[PDB]
Design a protein around this motif. Structure first.
Motif, PDB file in Angstrom:
ATOM      1  N   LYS A 161       0.825  -1.204   0.000  1.00  0.00           N
ATOM      2  CA  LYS A 161       0.000   0.000   0.000  1.00  0.00           C
ATOM      3  C   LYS A 161       0.863   1.259   0.000  1.00  0.00           C
ATOM      4  N   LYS A 162       2.175   1.082   0.137  1.00  0.00           N
ATOM      5  CA  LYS A 162       3.098   2.208   0.158  1.00  0.00           C
ATOM      6  C   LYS A 162       2.814   3.111   1.353  1.00  0.00           C
ATOM      7  N   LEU A 163       2.904   2.540   2.550  1.00  0.00           N
ATOM      8  CA  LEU A 163       2.661   3.288   3.775  1.00  0.00           C
ATOM      9  C   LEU A 163       3.943   3.965   4.253  1.00  0.00           C
ATOM     10  N   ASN A 164       3.883   4.582   5.427  1.00  0.00           N
ATOM     11  CA  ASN A 164       5.037   5.265   5.996  1.00  0.00           C
ATOM     12  C   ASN A 164       4.859   5.449   7.503  1.00  0.00           C
ATOM     13  N   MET A 165       5.548   4.618   8.275  1.00  0.00           N
ATOM     14  CA  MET A 165       5.466   4.671   9.730  1.00  0.00           C
ATOM     15  C   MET A 165       5.922   6.026  10.264  1.00  0.00           C
ATOM     16  N   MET A 166       6.659   6.770   9.447  1.00  0.00           N
ATOM     17  CA  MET A 166       7.145   8.081   9.854  1.00  0.00           C
ATOM     18  C   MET A 166       6.046   9.132   9.712  1.00  0.00           C
ATOM     19  N   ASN A 167       5.092   8.869   8.823  1.00  0.00           N
ATOM     20  CA  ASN A 167       3.983   9.788   8.598  1.00  0.00           C
ATOM     21  C   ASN A 167       2.776   9.387   9.441  1.00  0.00           C
ATOM     22  N   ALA A 168       2.126  10.374  10.043  1.00  0.00           N
ATOM     23  CA  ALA A 168       0.959  10.121  10.876  1.00  0.00           C
ATOM     24  C   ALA A 168      -0.237   9.697  10.033  1.00  0.00           C
ATOM     25  N   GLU A 169      -0.286  10.182   8.795  1.00  0.00           N
ATOM     26  CA  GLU A 169      -1.379   9.856   7.886  1.00  0.00           C
ATOM     27  C   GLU A 169      -1.412   8.363   7.575  1.00  0.00           C
ATOM     28  N   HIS A 170      -0.235   7.765   7.440  1.00  0.00           N
ATOM     29  CA  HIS A 170      -0.133   6.340   7.146  1.00  0.00           C
ATOM     30  C   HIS A 170      -0.196   5.519   8.429  1.00  0.00           C
ATOM     31  N   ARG A 171       0.511   5.984   9.457  1.00  0.00           N
ATOM     32  CA  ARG A 171       0.542   5.296  10.743  1.00  0.00           C
ATOM     33  C   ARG A 171      -0.866   4.895  11.175  1.00  0.00           C
TER      34      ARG A 171
END
Length: 92
Positions: free
Chosen positions: A54-64
């Motif tokens: 899904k191309k997430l990002n644990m660093m970004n709150a939107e993805h977290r």
């Protein structure tokens, strides 16, 4: 006592449960509470790939927050209780 056997919600059985909260806030609580180590190992595996697919990002709150959303449908696919903003005034 010397008896630590919780009742997982993902497996719907009685497991040994975890010893320390892994997730933050309340979410981590229910996981660490109703989601035993066995169940968590089933999500973590799908989590790492879910982030890459899904191309997430644990660093970004939107993805977290997104991850915490998917995990539910997998483990907490029944309660869907999400809370954000707990601040005890004096009593419970």
């Amino acid at each position: 006592m010397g008896s630590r056997t919780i009742f997982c919600t993902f497996l719907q059985r009685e497991a040994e449960g975890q010893d320390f909260q892994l997730y933050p806030g309340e979410l981590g609580k229910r996981i660490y509470n109703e989601i035993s180590k066995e169940a968590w190992a089933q999500w973590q595996h799908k989590q790492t790939m879910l982030i890459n697919e899904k191309k997430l990002n644990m660093m970004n709150a939107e993805h977290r927050k997104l991850l915490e959303q998917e995990m539910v449908n997998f483990l907490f696919e029944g309660k869907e209780v999400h809370i954000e903003g707990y601040t005890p005034e004096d009593k419970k």
